[PDB]
Symmetry: C4
Subunit: 265 residues, 4 copies
């Protein structure tokens, strides 16, 4: 949806990219300090005068507290920039190990959603179904799923607006979620999609959110995934194909396979 | 006098009553003062103690604070440049004590910094006022909240609680909480703006109530908001409370979605009422 | 209850005591390493021979990576104990900052329980009550309380055993818990203590657990407290005294005050 | 063949399929190998690279691994003893790169070590077998669990789930979960031993079921346990699964509280049945 109007770029991207961004910050800080050492004369013993190289590889050994010995500071000016850079490379370490420990605990759910939903007959009634799989060895316990219809309806005083329905499922918790789960909304008289058709959904501008949480044994943290389906992505009459080949195996290759009947025109 | 402040904090003086919470919830610039600050005064206290035991620093100029201080720094920080060095068993004691102080120091810092980095504000703006006005032909208590960020808040939960003085048969006067039922209390994706609605049916504890009856019971309304911030991959909490004098009877919130399809949060607190 | 039968002392005590325990571990490790430096001859340049002092204050400067310069190692023996002690004082730092960060997130609830319960008439019915207070400025949100009766009853085939009841409360959640909360179990016909008396509780060996949780704004963590009452600690006819003096104040001095009527013998 | 292993892990081969999880859940001695190990091979790789650019270490003996290696150590660890020093702009590059490697190294270590220190096992022992036998005159499916630690587990929750093959009218054969109701599913203080009981009333999905009927549906029972460990001030999870052949029909668990008032967990898995 398009926006309107009314430092904080605390962002986490690729692992390679993160390691460079942090390499980068370590250099430019070392350079800013080198500059400043030169910018009070030449206050580094054993340092070649009017050199960046020497005052930089001094900062490095001061921020990293290597303190190697040869390159030391000279009386009260550079001994002030040495106490400021001691702090910077101890806060620097703390922010780095923050971001690191943070990133190590912002974990992906590794939950695969079926490419489509189906409406087809299960225990006597037309039933809206979709399925999700765990892409990992490590189990997800206390896993809950919500299947929410959102669509356009009208009120008494017009103001024609957007309503949410939490579709009753045959089962909304998987006590351990390990392999695959087929989430089923039976379409009985109570259902907000009773009597509805491909066309009647399309008109109401009907979408289905599948919202998924569980506790991940992998991360010892709670984990979240969602997916949205349009009327376009429901195969009326479709049956998901068994993904459990027999000896007991689970083929995620069959995960998005749906069997429909085609009619003898 | 408000029993609850706007911000849902309690407005009641406590009696019969180290810190921590202040370092976490203080400004980023002010924090960076207090650690730089602690860092100087510990280097000072250690410089003093070195001088308190004579000329126990190699290549120091004697009875000097600057020399011993900028020695402390290089020991605490484990720089140990190797010119300004300690002397025999008097100083070398303080140098082991100080090495600890600047490894525990580092540990406390990373703790605070991580804590701070993972205690994030909800993006959440509450309407300044509530309204009672027809919705589906019934009087309906409403307020609205908005997400001030691009990043959605997932699996978002809202509670609207009446708190009011009530008298028993036994004539005990006590405060009672009520969780007003809402036409919708959940938002799967909360991205823009959400109007929360308590239909005042027969079951509602404010059925047949008026601006005057609410005022008598000292009625207050606490809004509680939670959800999951995909910004921070953490759960967020926001609360807000309203007094009687913050209900516009007959108010209607003005549409906040202007046109090329836009959310004007300038209009967010705007309420239209009819006048006579 | 008395026990029967069938390294891991990961314990957290006083703040002073914790700081010494960690001081202590830093010394004895430094001493164990000093010993070992002496235990391969005298392999420390500029170090007074057959001295503990010198080889200890060398370990310190090697484990702490001060590396001061004067005291260095001598060829392949002590250069092996220098790489082992580099690791020890980087794992040492990690365990220390672990324990520290851990302890900074094992926070006390600061929930005060009333010294006694009362049974007295509230909205028409005898009502078992007790109260709890927050001892802190920082609010507790999403606070839940359980009040559980445990007592001795008999089954059909004897095996006379110990049953739990979760007493219905007038309100078991405090949406924000800031000041004080009076938790009330109305004793109606459904109640497991309907018709019961001081004596009938005593016989059944009846105890009441009050179990309390909420999310602490202070710690951004979940927080837990419990308390158990015996039949002995119920004041039949007692009314808690108002702790809100009027201008609005909360006196926790009145917290444990209970008003009973005494009878004109 | 078990669909679920005893330990509640899934016993099914996966196809259509860096690490992390291995460092957290491996032995304490083996972990301390792998970090010492990583530490040596990185010092080696850095020693090699120093020698790959000639005699760029002061006071080193030339074409030497030990000298450059024990230089690496003193740089990575930021000891920098100040004798074994680097030479001009070739090495001094590798010395800045290496200073990083041993600050990120430290950060990864503290991460793992904290993670490990706060991922604690539940103290929990499950009975090896379940039993069906009269309790309050009804057949009753039972198992029991015990706390192997002194420290109570608070606000403890137990789920007992039947999982079995079922056929629809449409003749689709599928696996169905059922949450069997228990006489008690909560334990406020869980300190000793707890017998969990599914009365097999008319409502139970195993009403009128027999060892033979359960076997046909390939019935399995998953027990799920959670609570709050006052040991670790964290929540703990434990699961266990049983097959049909692990139900003793007519079994009764033997009392585990011997006498001076004692819990003999030797008796924990003991079941008494009548014989003919
Ligand atoms: K040095
Ligand atoms: K150093
Ligand atoms: K040196
Ligand atoms: Mg150092």
């Amino acid at each position: 949806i398009t926006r309107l109007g009314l430092y904080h770029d605390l962002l986490t991207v690729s692992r390679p990219v993160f390691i460079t961004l942090i390499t980068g910050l370590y250099l430019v800080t070392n350079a800013l300090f080198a500059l400043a050492y030169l910018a009070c004369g030449d206050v580094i013993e054993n340092a070649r005068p009017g050199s960046f190289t020497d005052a930089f590889f001094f900062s490095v050994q001061t921020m990293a507290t290597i303190g190697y010995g040869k390159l030391i500071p000279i009386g009260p000016l550079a001994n002030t920039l040495v106490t400021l850079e001691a702090l910077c490379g101890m806060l620097g370490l703390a922010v780095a190990a923050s971001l690191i420990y943070a990133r190590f605990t912002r974990p992906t759910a590794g939950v695969l959603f079926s490419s489509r939903m189906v409406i087809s007959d299960f225990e006597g009634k037309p039933t809206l179904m979709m399925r999700l799989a765990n892409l990992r060895i490590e189990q997800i316990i206390e896993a809950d799923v919500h299947l929410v219809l959102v669509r356009s309806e009208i009120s008494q005083e017009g103001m024609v607006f957007r309503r949410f329905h939490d579709l009753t499922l045959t089962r909304s918790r998987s006590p351990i979620f390990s392999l695959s789960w087929t989430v089923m909304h039976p379409i009985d008289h109570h259902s907000p999609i009773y009597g509805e058709t491909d066309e009647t959904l399309r008109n109401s501008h009907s979408e289905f959110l599948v919202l998924f949480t569980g506790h991940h044994e992998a991360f010892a943290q709670n984990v979240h995934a969602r997916h949205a389906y349009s009327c376009d992505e429901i195969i009326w009459g479709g049956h998901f194909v068994d993904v459990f080949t027999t000896r007991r195996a689970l083929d995620l290759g069959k995960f998005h396979e749906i069997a429909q009947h085609h009619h003898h025109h």
